[PDB]
């Protein structure tokens, strides 16, 4: 038992991380088969990063303008193209460490592991969630662009995030591995603001179930609520609305614990209305919303 913010083992991804330099700009790339993927920001002229014309900049590059290093080995780029906000560098060597993988675009509330890298080398691994406002609350410094987020529930590495940028509030924005940004953000240093963030209600409920599974019961109550009454309380606290799909997803946990979903919603309502009373749940004094129902089942699977 116990409950921790657990990331996936990062080895399968470490074996894919390279350094990409174009001109005076360096960031990380993801070397899968004979293609290195990285943010197209690497081709910016380190002067025009407000309104770069990436199509214009790329056609002026030669393959030999890109310096790709995998450890001591320099990889030869033999072609380059752009898919949305991601640059694809064809190299003459397939990565022998390429895992089984796929690219997946995730929904807000989904969680994933981040391998934070600098100059193609890993610094550390942590767990994140796609926020409702399509930012992620990462830990990234200059040079971290091209770090990726991933899941490995089985033997397949699901790449879902490539890091690009930090916003003024210190949260982060990036793309899927097809180069489409999450949210309305763009890979330009024009002023951009994240929308108001909200709490991922379905994840809070999953975590309350995780607490009951681990022996907590102090926050349970005799009350039940309707989905609409709960949703009226939730929006008053900047909580995401709960849908019937969420209720369905919470089914297995409600069955494993014997506590109906709307019975747990009433617990959440009381915690919101009356606070936590200086008490903790699973070692936290605030409600945690970056564990999904799937995360809870995986970590609490006997």
């Amino acid at each position: 038992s116990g409950f921790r913010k657990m990331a996936f083992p990062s080895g399968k991804v470490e074996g894919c991380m390279v350094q990409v330099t174009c001109g005076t700009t360096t960031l990380n790339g993801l070397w899968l088969d004979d293609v290195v993927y990285c943010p197209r920001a690497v081709i910016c002229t380190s002067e025009d990063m407000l309104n770069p014309n990436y199509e214009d900049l790329l056609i002026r590059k030669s393959n030999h303008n890109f310096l790709v290093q995998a450890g001591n080995v320099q990889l030869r780029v033999i072609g380059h193209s752009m898919q949305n906000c991601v640059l694809k560098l064809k190299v003459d060597t397939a990565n022998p460490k390429t895992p089984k993988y796929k690219f997946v675009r995730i929904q807000p509330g989904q969680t994933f592991s981040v391998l934070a890298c600098y100059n193609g080398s890993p610094s550390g691994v942590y767990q994140c969630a796609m926020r409702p406002n399509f930012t992620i609350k990462g830990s990234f410094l200059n040079g971290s662009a091209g770090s990726v987020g991933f899941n490995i529930d089985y033997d397949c590495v699901s790449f879902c995030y490539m890091h690009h940028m930090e916003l003024p509030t210190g949260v982060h924005a990036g793309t899927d591995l097809e180069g489409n940004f999450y949210g309305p953000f763009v890979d330009r240093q024009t002023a951009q603001a994240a929308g108001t963030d909200t709490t991922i209600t379905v994840n809070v409920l999953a975590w309350l179930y995780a607490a009951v599974i681990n022996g907590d019961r102090w926050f349970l109550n005799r009350f039940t609520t309707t989905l609409n009454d709960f949703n009226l309380v939730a929006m008053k606290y900047n909580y995401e609305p709960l849908t019937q799909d969420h209720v369905d997803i919470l089914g297995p946990l409600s069955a494993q614990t014997g506590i109906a979903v709307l019975d747990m919603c009433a617990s959440l309502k009381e915690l919101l209305q009356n606070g936590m009373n200086g008490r903790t749940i699973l070692g936290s004094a605030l409600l945690e919303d970056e564990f999904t129902p799937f995360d809870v089942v995986r970590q609490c699977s006997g």
């Binding site: 005076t24 700009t25 360096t26 960031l27 943010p39 920001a41 690497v42 910016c44 380190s46 990063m49 600098y118 100059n119 990234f140 410094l141 200059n142 040079g143 971290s144 662009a145 890091h163 690009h164 940028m165 930090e166 916003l167 003024p168 890979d187 330009r188 240093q189 024009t190 002023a191 951009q192």
Partner: peptide, 10 residues
């Protein structure tokens, strides 16, 4: 801005 593409320069 305070909106930064987190590449590294030089």
């Amino acid at each position: 801005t305070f909106t930064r593409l987190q590449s590294l320069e030089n």
